[PDB]
Amino acid sequence: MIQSQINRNIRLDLADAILLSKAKKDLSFAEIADGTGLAEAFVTAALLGQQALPADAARLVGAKLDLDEDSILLLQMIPLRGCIDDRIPTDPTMYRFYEMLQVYGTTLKALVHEKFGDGIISAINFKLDVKKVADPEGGERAVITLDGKYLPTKPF
Amino acid sequence: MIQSQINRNIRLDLADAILLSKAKKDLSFAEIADGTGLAEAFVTAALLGQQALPADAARLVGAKLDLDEDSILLLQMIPLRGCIDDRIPTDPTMYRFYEMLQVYGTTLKALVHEKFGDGIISAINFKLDVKKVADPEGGERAVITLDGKYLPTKPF
Amino acid sequence: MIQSQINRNIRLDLADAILLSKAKKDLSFAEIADGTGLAEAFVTAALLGQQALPADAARLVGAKLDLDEDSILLLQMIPLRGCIDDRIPTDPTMYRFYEMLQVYGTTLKALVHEKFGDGIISAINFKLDVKKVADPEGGERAVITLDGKYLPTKPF
Amino acid sequence: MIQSQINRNIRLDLADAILLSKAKKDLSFAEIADGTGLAEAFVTAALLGQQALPADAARLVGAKLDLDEDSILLLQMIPLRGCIDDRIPTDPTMYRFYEMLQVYGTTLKALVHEKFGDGIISAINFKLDVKKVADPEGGERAVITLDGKYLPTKPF
Amino acid sequence: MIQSQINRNIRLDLADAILLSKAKKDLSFAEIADGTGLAEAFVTAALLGQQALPADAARLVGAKLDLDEDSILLLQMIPLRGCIDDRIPTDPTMYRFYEMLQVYGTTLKALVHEKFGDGIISAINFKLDVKKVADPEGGERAVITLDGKYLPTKPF
Amino acid sequence: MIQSQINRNIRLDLADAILLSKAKKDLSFAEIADGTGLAEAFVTAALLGQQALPADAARLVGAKLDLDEDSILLLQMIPLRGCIDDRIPTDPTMYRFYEMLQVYGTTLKALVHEKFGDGIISAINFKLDVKKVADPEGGERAVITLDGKYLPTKPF
Amino acid sequence: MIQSQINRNIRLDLADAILLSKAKKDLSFAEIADGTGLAEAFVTAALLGQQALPADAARLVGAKLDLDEDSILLLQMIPLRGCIDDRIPTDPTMYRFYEMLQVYGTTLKALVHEKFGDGIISAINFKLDVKKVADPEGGERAVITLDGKYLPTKPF
Amino acid sequence: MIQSQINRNIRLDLADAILLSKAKKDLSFAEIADGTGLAEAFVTAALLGQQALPADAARLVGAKLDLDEDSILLLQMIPLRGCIDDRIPTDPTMYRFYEMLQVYGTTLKALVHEKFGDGIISAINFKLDVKKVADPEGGERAVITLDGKYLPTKPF
Amino acid sequence: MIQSQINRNIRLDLADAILLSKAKKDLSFAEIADGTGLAEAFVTAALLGQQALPADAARLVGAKLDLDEDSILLLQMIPLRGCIDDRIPTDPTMYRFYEMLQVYGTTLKALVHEKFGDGIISAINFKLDVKKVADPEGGERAVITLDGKYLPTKPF
Amino acid sequence: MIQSQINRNIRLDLADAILLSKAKKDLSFAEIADGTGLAEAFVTAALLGQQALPADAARLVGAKLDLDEDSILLLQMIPLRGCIDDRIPTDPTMYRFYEMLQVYGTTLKALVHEKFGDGIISAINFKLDVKKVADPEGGERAVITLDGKYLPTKPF
Numbered sequence A, B, C, D, E, F, G, H, I, J: 001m002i003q004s005q006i007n008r009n010i011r012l013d014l015a016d017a018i019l020l021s022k023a024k025k026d027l028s029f030a031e032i033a034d035g036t037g038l039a040e041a042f043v044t045a046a047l048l049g050q051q052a053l054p055a056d057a058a059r060l061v062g063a064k065l066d067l068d069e070d071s072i073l074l075l076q077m078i079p080l081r082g083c084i085d086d087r088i089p090t091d092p093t094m095y096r097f098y099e100m101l102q103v104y105g106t107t108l109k110a111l112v113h114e115k116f117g118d119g120i121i122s123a124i125n126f127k128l129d130v131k132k133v134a135d136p137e138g139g140e141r142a143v144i145t146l147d148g149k150y151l152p153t154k155p156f
């Protein structure tokens, strides 16, 4: 039977413990997700308290990180989601994604309504991935793809 | 000589007048940007107060929307950016992008540091675009690509 | 071409003009929605800035309220939604629905994941309605039905 | 003699312990409330710190969850209610109910005044229930019924 | 037909205009309410935007204050209630009532539950009045009587 | 020598411990205050961190609740007052007193200035009490009397 | 008959008009208060919306500032006090008085309880004054005297 | 070598321990400061986490309060100042000083600019003291003297 | 006689008008400050509402921008300072300076205490300037110099 | 493999323990950084939770401060950056840098756009330093140099 959380601090405390174990073992997120059959973004989000892992994946990452049975069980519980400490990120890496919404948020609304209609792009029927691409002028770029279903708003 | 704003309400009021003109003329953002040589996300953002148009594009979109000369000059001003009225969007279409940050923000931090290193993905050396793709399960998806330069944080 | 708003004050100012006209004509929301083919909750939400009317409904309600052509066009624009002035309602009638979330919000979460699974009850593939029922102990009750599709959160 | 709490964190910490015990037993909220005589929404809310259980119900749920005597006693205390961590939910599942208020809160006020009059729909002489139904179009829907007494506001 | 407001500013602006007229005429709240059949606290609250006057009262007070027909109609609309500008009062006179809740709010909760049970004292089936009483030690005291119905919270 | 606190959490943590002991002993606030010579509202507020008890009263309640010496001493310290967790109560029973201020705050100001003059009704030279009485229409009402000295604001 | 305000913006707009008149006349606050029989801090506070003037003072400062009859009347109304735009000052000169509270506020509490007892130093039976003195080290100092009555908190 | 703090909770937790020792020993702030050669207001602020003590004074107060060596070292660290829990005081004694700024803050600005010029009254080149004075109408008054250097704002 | 403001919107409205004039004339801040004998940072800050210009400088910039007499007068008034709309900038350009504080504020605290002692680096006895220079690795850098007097905190 | 944190409290608690150890050993930040090859601002920022130390530097400063192996590992993790407790500093020393932004933020934006163009001065490709300089008029000044790359915002 599915089990859910109502206080994010239980899973965020678990995330800190996971990160300490990961650093002592000198592991990467890519290696932790290898063998799970699931995307690194989804498995990493689960470790950090923002998704639930199916039981086989929870057991696999739990073995890798030497987690105890209550922690393996917690990873399978549906989380109380919300990773930002107090609404607006302070960390510069996270903040730039918030700034993209301060600059482009009304343009995303306007272009979603023009291309699709009234309604939303879902954050639930939704995938994201991060890719590293060479910049032709020198250095490296991240191409982050947000891929969400359009759900319409219609009269009733 | 470059000119800049410090009170966002000037450009946001102009945006509201632009949208009324646009609706009276039954125009699209794609047709407003057509002919400018600039991407619809950039031109749209400028109309909405969050970018500046070069003078030729300002005159081109000003002719389409029948803007007066003060308005065409305002579109060339560097804006005081920030499109969200009070930090967290209330509109559902805009909110889902904020929710993507609440769910995935720490994942994007973690994977950016793993793939690239300490530092950020820029929101300045940066472009985004919105594409509509058929969903194979039925319906339509938006694929929103966020494409930013990696800037490293190094000791000194 | 679909048209959209980015600043809620345009439509909320329109809503105040609509309400004054409505009061001077001594009209009900039920009579305004009559003839539109649309439910009272949907047409009232549009008048109040939170939904868009299709053109024929916009014209019908515009003639009933003696609205000008710019106002009739604005009712057809997709709104920048969000009716609460500053996040938490002060009005008692509105505040009770916010208190229902403070008391039952975690229970709604828990029972939605138990009955359906990880994911959400949508606020987009969604409708509500308000009915009056007699109370057997004396007086009247409101039965307010929230009806949303379940959308699952699945691994990828 | 009735007993009441003034700091929500006592009952919220108990809720987190309750959830871990429940998960270890693979228990449902429907099964926990079975045999209490009381509706699953009410019993679940008490577990989660937002209602008080009568003594018999507290002892019965305490047996199912292996709670100690201080925990059984705490479930009978009248709670300091308020389940949302910081006024606006971060969790997507809970957030959709807040969004319903941002889109329909003024329409609920207006139609409550039209159908009933000045005053409120109570959140205290009040019950709610969550029912899973089949979506005739495919999939599943939740029908959440908010059933509150109308209390008039009258001159005096 | 009942009519209701959604933006408090319209009635709060009218209250400022009423207070200017009141002061020019050197009128008391007591004499404005006298002859209406309605208690001073109710009529004063309506002038200040927090209650609706019946039509005959709105005409009476309207003639006393030389208000126009749009203002007399606005006094009859059900308000969007909430008199505090931004949640906590800045005015010392209003602030002391907020401090009474900061000092005694948990005691009022605890004593309400002990004397009555779980549930609330209503702010809707409710009246208050302000009386001046001599202090035996010299000076004057206010006795403000809050008189609300108890509404129980019971299991279902 | 009088002793005072600067961090409310010390006395709020003591209040939680007091309430657990009270519940285990199945005591009322009325009986705890019996024999102190002090009003139930004042003694209860002290238990809950918002007043100080005189030494003899602190020893009397301390014997009834089986408190240790540091707890008895802490009850005699002048508190850092303020019982509301975060400015606006979440709990419905407490919230209704806050709503009374949102509806009648400006009326209380206006009537206090008319009946007394410029200045305040004190929250320091002040007492309150709670009585339970029948409602003439059925059920029960609370009559809560706020009794504060008028302190004038005069020119200087 | 005493008259009072409920929205601070009426008197704060009058303050701005007063300050423009004062500047055109090259007047000082000390000259404006001259001849009124009232202290410059009290009169200046009334001009800035935070006190009420007696009628003879209001006419006198009105003569000096060329104010109209409605403005002289508004200065006699009891204000809705609160001069800080949004709770914490941004202006450096104002901000330093807030900082004094951040550094010494708990010391002020401690020493007031030690010297006087439980209770407050009043902000109502209260005067302040600002004096310029030489700094013996070079330069000038302000000596700002806060002079308030102690009102005890006693058991009841 | 000077040492400083960056998180206020270390010294605020020290303050709470100091206050419990002080109350167990039934000591006053006047007596703790005796023999230190420093003003009671300065030493008290140090104990409460808002100033640093020189080493001889830290050893002297440490012996009176039976503090351990780490605590005596912590009292010598330059603090992370800010005594107010969350920006606006809840405690009545502290809040009256904040209300003085809500009433007189713009008058302090105005008269400081008039008497001295553009710039500030420092909160660093600054002292304060609290004196008890009999009120001639009966009772006692506190005279709190704020004494800061004027620092001008000049063009450059 | 020096004249001061208490509502920032008067001078921020003037700033918008100055910026519109500046842009129509295609002027730079460097050219506006030329001849004034004052630094561009100081003159610019005055135009934007955050400093007062001496009368001769005001006259001369007023000439260039064609300002009316109430505007040349307003420029000489002491402002109510605070340029950020709502505490945290949304504009990227401004936000990076806030981020520098989020990353290095505690380091600045620590290194100021070690290099100078307890106290502050003044923001009043203070000058700032911005220089553009080449980056030795390609591109351009800003070298922004914050130059403030050290003011000590010492015992009294 | 790079490792990163998501809860700042782990590294902020480490900072408090570092500072205690530093004070017990009577060390300076200058001597902790001496010998690492890294600038004092960078090393100090790492100790305080806002930068990551390379492994050799983490071992070097770990020996100097007698840190354990877990602490030395934590210093190598990329931090969740943000040193300000709750957005606006309370500490006077930190607050003055926030005030510099309130006074000059719009002037920094305006002069950055004038000298460079649209875009930002980076807080990533960025260094700062603090120097002590004698003031010619007496005392000492800090010269704090902020040195950031310009990144342009260009059309696309």
Ligand SMILES: O=C([O-])C(=O)[O-]
Residues within 6 Å of the ligand: A120, A121, A122, A123, A124, A125, A151, B096, C120, C121, C122, C123, C124, C125, C151, D096
């Ligand atoms: O994000 C969503 O998909 C919603 O409400 O339907």
Ligand SMILES: O=C([O-])C(=O)[O-]
Residues within 6 Å of the ligand: C096, D120, D121, D122, D123, D124, D125, D151, E120, E121, E122, E123, E124, E125, E151, F096
């Ligand atoms: O919700 C309520 O029932 C109230 O105030 O009466």
Ligand SMILES: O=C([O-])C(=O)[O-]
Residues within 6 Å of the ligand: E096, F120, F121, F122, F123, F124, F125, F151, G120, G121, G122, G123, G124, G125, G151, H096
């Ligand atoms: O509440 C009070 O009594 C005051 O400030 O004087």
Ligand SMILES: O=C([O-])C(=O)[O-]
Residues within 6 Å of the ligand: G096, H120, H121, H122, H123, H124, H125, H151, I120, I121, I122, I123, I124, I125, I151, J096
């Ligand atoms: O308070 C102060 O002294 C400052 O910034 O100079």
Ligand SMILES: O=C([O-])C(=O)[O-]
Residues within 6 Å of the ligand: A096, B120, B121, B122, B123, B124, B125, B151, I096, J120, J121, J122, J123, J124, J125, J151
């Ligand atoms: O977003 C950015 O590019 C920054 O600070 O460098």
